[PDB]
Write a protein that binds this ligand. Structure first.
Ligand SMILES: OC[C@H]1O[C@H](OC[C@H]2O[C@H](O[C@@H]3[C@@H](O)[C@@H](O)O[C@H](CO[C@H]4O[C@H](CO)[C@@H](O)[C@H](O)[C@H]4O)[C@H]3O)[C@H](O)[C@@H](O)[C@@H]2O)[C@H](O)[C@@H](O)[C@@H]1O
Ligand SMILES: OC[C@H]1O[C@H](OC[C@H]2O[C@H](O[C@H]3[C@H](O)[C@@H](O)[C@@H](O)O[C@@H]3CO)[C@H](O)[C@@H](O)[C@@H]2O)[C@H](O)[C@@H](O)[C@@H]1O
Ligand SMILES: OC[C@H]1O[C@H](OC[C@H]2O[C@H](O)[C@H](O)[C@@H](O)[C@@H]2O)[C@H](O)[C@@H](O)[C@@H]1O
Ligand SMILES: OC[C@H]1O[C@H](OC[C@H]2O[C@H](O)[C@H](O)[C@@H](O)[C@@H]2O)[C@H](O)[C@@H](O)[C@@H]1O
Ligand SMILES: OC[C@H]1O[C@H](O[C@H]2[C@H](O)[C@@H](O)[C@@H](O)O[C@@H]2CO)[C@H](O)[C@@H](O)[C@@H]1O
Ligand SMILES: [Mg+2]
Ligand SMILES: [Mg+2]
Ligand SMILES: [Mg+2]
Ligand SMILES: [Mg+2]
Ligand SMILES: [Mg+2]
Length: 1059
């Protein structure tokens, strides 16, 4: 009773339907097979193909039995091979015993082959664009390649194979040197060297440094055509040295450096095994090379980036097209001031990140199992009882699970013709008796709530009045996409929401309707945005959208049309509304948060999540989240939960979530449930430490969020984004930069406590304890399960919201309308400046500058007008005085006195931080710390040999001192920076020698001297001896030894380097 063949199937990249044509788009010399099905299985069935070649009727092709399966027979018809330009049209047919024939088709394909640019025959400079007139290696086209400047450092190439299209205008600030053999195009930032015969482009910086170039054999640039009807693909090919690293490509789970891979720009919903399958929800045809350029292929069609995956020194892109011969290839080679500036330039092209409200940057709580008011009340109560000041709240299991815009258990008179509901239309029952009151109680807790959504109208063949009404309206209005035959497009039956009808987000009227149905959720229920899931749901080549585009072009674009439509809609009603989504392509960054999707509770998954965040970052998707510790699989171990917590608190968006809808016991990845499930009570204080730390750093984090929106600098960055020339930074995927100043190194390996941290050149200070670490090597950091290595860069100015306790990890709550103690942590190093985004006070930028002058025992802070009292925490030795506007401020002897003071200073001996309180003033204030040196290098943080630490004599700095240190083969080794370059310095050695005069031997980069340490009154008396040393650039190895000619026990507190 039937026959079926459909040449492209669902056009899936990864799989085929069993009734497709192979190849889908035949090239010259390729054997063409047609897979055909008939049903039911019967003897005496014939299957054949009726067809024409170049309009000429051919002898029928008889199909061969392939296999039987289920109710069906599958057959193969072999059409043979074809030549470039052949136009084949066929109809597949089946009948039983000479009866009624069932057929599919007709279907046409045009047989293609590659044509490439040969030579540049002439150059036409039009002032805002340059045309290169070209010959082709085959065919009769007259190609034109157009060059323009999006900016003086960003080159755009537009290729028209037929020469019938014209490129776009760019900047005029270029000069041209056109010669017989070569044309050179120059700006203040770029030198574009184009050989004419054969055509070959090299892109150089203006100083001559090569950025990238086309492949050396040339004929690199080409298009796939029958020469008459279709252009089906484009390619270009580039030369790449062995060491070149390639970053970005959207959100990638397998690796941060794609060298060696064929990367598919193809959005896909892959559950749990994204790394293994090399798939992603969020695919962007943009990469950044550590050779200091980006490349962006400007098209929504699928592309494949072959990154030294075929030939060791070649990278290529192959870009699909729908056949339209008027669609130019359009790509950019992007330079800039640095790697982050390359990202900024990319965002000039594809869209800036939209700044989200500060609440988006606190903790988000989520669990699929929350499905009733009492679950929401319990979540709020549990958060409150456990001192968890979260700011975001997600509900997934909230709706009727039919319309997805009506609360579960709500009753109402159904509405026809897609008419919208108001709040008053509903009687609220059962699980949700008062959604408005429920939302109000979330707001009372200082949280903001988002509701889960999909872009599809569900249709599983069940009867459900409202859903049925909406479907009839949607179809009659043409608010769906079209399947290509005049019927609404439905998601393929085997997929998530199979048989459902996608809303055509290209259709403004459709969007207005769809969103109107949700209006009451925003205006009356008072929600704060949507979790817009899915979107990877466009299949089929003939699927047609209101914009005239079809399924090949729209698959990658659809999720971003969907996500952006909802984001803009929610914001139009509630300016503080935030979206939380997983899928998209270039431009996704304009529309809210992206999370890394569906992963298991394992360390392998944690590793893949971090790769996903780092690649997304390079791709301009900065507001990135993950389900901390995984949302499914066996419940995370306490170790994984703690490791994930620490990293999550230092990532752009912090969010816990769980998959299961009605589990027993609870699957919540909340800290209180983690305690319950693992039995490890210490999870709670560890979680609190990290969450409170994040809240302490929220002024810094939110300023970084604004810097993303303004300047294209992502919040969390792979090391080579800041240090592209650093050979050790190239492949690192277990540490990153967070904001401008913090190097974060999470432990993402099971059982690991010795964490390698690569430190780039410069000085890095442990933010938790003041340990100093000279850059330019990989250090080993001991991190137990509760510990996260985080370091501040030299010169850092870090705004913080602190309690009167003034330590990191102390709860300041979630009231985002005020600070407790606004604080700036400062690591003085030369002259540094910072622009603080003061969201509490109308979004004023506060420009702070620090002038480090340790050589003259001074640090100066230029504080602008502020609306709040401010506390500086300056990393330094103890001042002899502090002035504000020249006037001495009072030394506070205790933290209590400091807190009570209007202005003053206090010295934290454990952290080596000077606190300075300045009153709120509507004028600039000049703060000077006098008598200060670079903070001490604590002996207890040194590399120790046969020697231990103690704290049983008062008055030390840091956490203690090295004790006794009085036998041969005992050593204390320091890694010491020069304060102001290679020079002689004075090294202060602070020690106690309670019994008798002591001596120790010191080696400074291998150069030995002996030092005399006179007796102190007793072991509770410290003294300082000044030792002349010569220090060079970089890390200076300073070794204190007890050798054979040394004498007596000492307690060794610290060293200070001064003029
Ligand atoms: O950024 C500075 C350091 O921060 C962390 O340590 C802070 C603590 O440092 C001291 O004591 C620690 C030890 O008790 C031990 O358990 O862990 C680490 C390092 O272990 C080993 O390091 C050296 C070899 O590389 C050896 O010299 C040493 O004998 C080994 O035990 C120690 O740092 C203080 O005494 C504590 O008060 C302080 O809290 C971080 O762990 C460390 O790696 C950083 O360098
Ligand atoms: O009650 C609403 C809804 O709950 C579940 O879906 C919520 C989750 O949706 C996403 O994950 C789904 C995948 O997209 C599917 O392809 C498939 O693998 O199943 C998962 C469910 O885990 C999302 O990424 C998750 O964060 C959400 O928890 C049910 O699956 C739906 O049927 C319900 O309508
Ligand atoms: O739109 C369908 C239906 O929704 C509401 O009632 C919810 C309803 O769901 C199923 O149809 C069950 O059979 C009922 O027991 C539930 O109450 C509207 O009140 C109703 O008018 C409408 O048909
Ligand atoms: O040479 C003096 C002294 O050195 C060592 O003891 C150092 C030790 O002395 C007291 O116990 C203090 O309380 C500690 O803080 C010091 O580290 C030798 O052990 C000792 O024999 C000698 O007299
Ligand atoms: O209507 C198009 C549809 O045809 C085929 O489905 C058949 C199936 O193979 C038979 O066993 C029987 O159940 O009837 C169906 C037609 O209703 C294709 O297999 C299917 O992919 C296609 O959509
Ligand atoms: Mg720029
Ligand atoms: Mg529940
Ligand atoms: Mg606050
Ligand atoms: Mg305050
Ligand atoms: Mg000390």
């Amino acid at each position: 009773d039937g026959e079926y063949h459909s040449p492209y199937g669902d056009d899936d990249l990864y799989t085929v339907q069993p009734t497709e044509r192979s190849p889908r788009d035949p090239k010259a010399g390729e054997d063409v097979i047609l897979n055909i099905t008939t049903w039911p299985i019967e003897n005496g069935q014939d299957v054949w193909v009726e067809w024409t070649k170049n309009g000429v009727a051919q002898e029928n092709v008889t199909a061969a039995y392939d296999y039987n399966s289920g109710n069906n027979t599958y057959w193969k018809a072999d059409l043979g091979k074809f030549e470039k330009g052949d136009e084949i049209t066929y109809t597949t047919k089946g009948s039983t015993n000479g009866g009624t024939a069932y057929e599919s088709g007709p279907f046409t394909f045009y047989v293609t082959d590659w044509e490439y640019v040969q030579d540049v025959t002439s150059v036409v400079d039009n002032g805002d664009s340059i045309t290169l007139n070209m010959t082709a290696t085959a065919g009769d086209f007259s190609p034109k390649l157009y060059l323009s400047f999006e900016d003086l450092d960003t080159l755009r190439m537009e290729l028209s194979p037929t020469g019938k299209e014209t490129g776009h205008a760019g900047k005029s600030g270029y000069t041209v040197e056109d010669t017989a053999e070569k044309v050179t195009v120059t700006t203040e930032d770029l030198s574009i060297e184009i050989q004419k015969s054969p055509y070959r482009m090299e892109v150089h910086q203006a100083d001559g440094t090569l950025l990238t170039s086309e492949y050396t054999t040339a004929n690199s640039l080409g298009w796939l055509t029958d020469g008459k009807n279709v252009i089906n693909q484009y390619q270009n090919n580039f030369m790449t040295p062995s060491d070149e690293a390639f970053y970005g490509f959207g959100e990638r789970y397998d690796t941060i450096n794609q060298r060696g891979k064929d990367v598919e720009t193809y959005v896909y919903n892959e559950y749990q095994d994204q790394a293994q399958t090399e798939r992603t929800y969020l695919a962007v045809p943009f990469f950044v090379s550590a050779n200091k350029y980006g490349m962006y292929v400007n098209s929504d069609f699928h592309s494949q980036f072959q990154m030294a995956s075929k030939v060791e020194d070649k990278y290529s892109f192959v870009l699909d097209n729908d056949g339209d011969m008027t669609n130019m290839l359009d790509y950019y080679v992007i330079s800039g001031k640095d790697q982050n500036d390359i990202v900024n330039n990319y965002t000039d092209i594809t869209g800036k990140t939209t700044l989200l409200p500060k609440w988006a940057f606190g903790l988000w709580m989520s669990a699929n199992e929350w499905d009733r008011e009492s679950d929401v009340s319990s979540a709020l109560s549990n958060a409150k009882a456990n001192d968890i000041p979260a700011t975001g709240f997600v509900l997934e299991q909230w709706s009727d699970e039919e319309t997805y815009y009506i609360w579960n258990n709500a009753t109402y008179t159904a509405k026809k013709n897609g008419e919208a509901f108001s709040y008053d239309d509903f009687t609220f029952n059962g699980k949700w008796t008062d959604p408005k009151g429920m939302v109000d109680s979330v707001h009372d807790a200082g949280m903001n709530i988002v509701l889960w959504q999909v872009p599809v109208l569900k249709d599983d063949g069940t009867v459900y009045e409202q859903r049925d009404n909406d479907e009839e309206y949607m179809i009659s209005q043409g608010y769906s996409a079209d399947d290509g035959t005049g019927a609404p497009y439905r998601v393929p039956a085997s997929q998530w929401f199979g048989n459902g009808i996608l809303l055509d987000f290209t259709n403004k009227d459709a969007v207005d309707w769809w969103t109107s149905q949700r209006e009451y959720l925003l205006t009356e229920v008072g929600i704060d945005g949507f979790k817009t899931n899915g979107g990877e749901m466009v299949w089929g080549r003939d699927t047609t959208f209101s914009n005239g585009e079809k399924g090949q072009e729209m698959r990658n674009r659809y999720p971003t049309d969907y996500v952006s439509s909802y984001f803009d809609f929610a914001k139009s009603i509630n300016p503080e509304a935030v979206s939380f989504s997983r899928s998209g392509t270039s431009g996704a960054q304009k529309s809210g948060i992206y999370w890394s999707g569906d992963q298991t509770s394992t360390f392998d998954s944690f590793q893949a999540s971090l790769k996903a965040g780092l690649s997304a970052s390079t791709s301009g998707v900065s507001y990135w989240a993950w389900d901390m510790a995984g949302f499914t699989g066996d419940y995370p171990t306490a170790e994984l939960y703690k490791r994930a917590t620490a990293m999550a608190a230092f990532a752009p968006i912090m969010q816990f979530h769980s998959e299961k809808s009605d589990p027993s016991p609870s699957e919540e990845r909340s800290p209180w449930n983690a305690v319950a499930r693992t039995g490890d009570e210490t999870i709670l204080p560890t979680f609190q430490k990290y969450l409170y730390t994040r809240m302490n750093l929220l002024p810094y984090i939110y300023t970084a969020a604004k810097d993303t929106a303004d300047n294209g600098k992502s919040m969390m960055r792979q090391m080579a984004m800041d240090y592209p020339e650093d050979v050790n930074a190239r492949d690192l995927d277990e540490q990153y930069m967070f904001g401008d100043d913090l190097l974060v190194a999470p432990i993402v390996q099971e059982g690991q406590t010795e964490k390698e941290v690569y430190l780039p050149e410069g000085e890095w200070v442990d933010i938790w304890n003041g340990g100093v670490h000279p850059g330019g090597e990989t250090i080993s950091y001991y991190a137990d399960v509760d510990t996260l290595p985080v370091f501040a860069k030299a010169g850092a100015i870090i705004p913080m919201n602190m309690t009167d306790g003034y330590q990191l990890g102390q709860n300041v709550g979630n009231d985002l309308k005020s600070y407790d103690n606004l604080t700036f942590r400062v690591y003085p190093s030369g002259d540094s400046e910072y622009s603080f985004y003061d969201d509490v006070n109308g979004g004023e930028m506060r420009d702070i500058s620090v002038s480090e002058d340790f050589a003259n025992e001074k640090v100066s802070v230029d504080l602008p007008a502020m609306a709040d009292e401010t506390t500086m925490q300056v990393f330094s030795t103890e001042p002899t005085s502090v002035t504000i506007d020249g006037a001495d401020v009072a030394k506070a002897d205790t933290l209590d006195a400091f807190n009570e003071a209007t202005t003053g200073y206090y010295y934290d001996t454990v952290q080596n931080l000077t606190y300075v309180k300045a009153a709120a003033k509507d004028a600039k204030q000049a703060i000077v710390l006098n008598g200060v040196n670079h903070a001490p290098y604590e002996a207890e943080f040194g590399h120790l040999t046969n020697v231990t630490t103690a704290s049983d004599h008062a008055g030390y700095t840091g956490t203690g001192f090295v004790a006794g240190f009085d036998a041969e083969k005992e050593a204390v080794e320091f890694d010491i920076d020069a304060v102001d370059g290679a020079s002689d310095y004075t090294m202060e050695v602070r020690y106690s020698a309670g019994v008798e005069d002591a001596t120790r031997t010191v080696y400074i980069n291998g150069k030995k001297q002996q030092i005399t340490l006179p007796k102190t009154a007793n072991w509770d008396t410290w003294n300082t001896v000044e030792v002349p040393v010569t220090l060079q650039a970089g890390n200076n190895q300073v070794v204190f030894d007890f050798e054979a000619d040394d004498t007596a026990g000492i307690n060794f507190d610290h060293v200070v380097i001064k003029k």
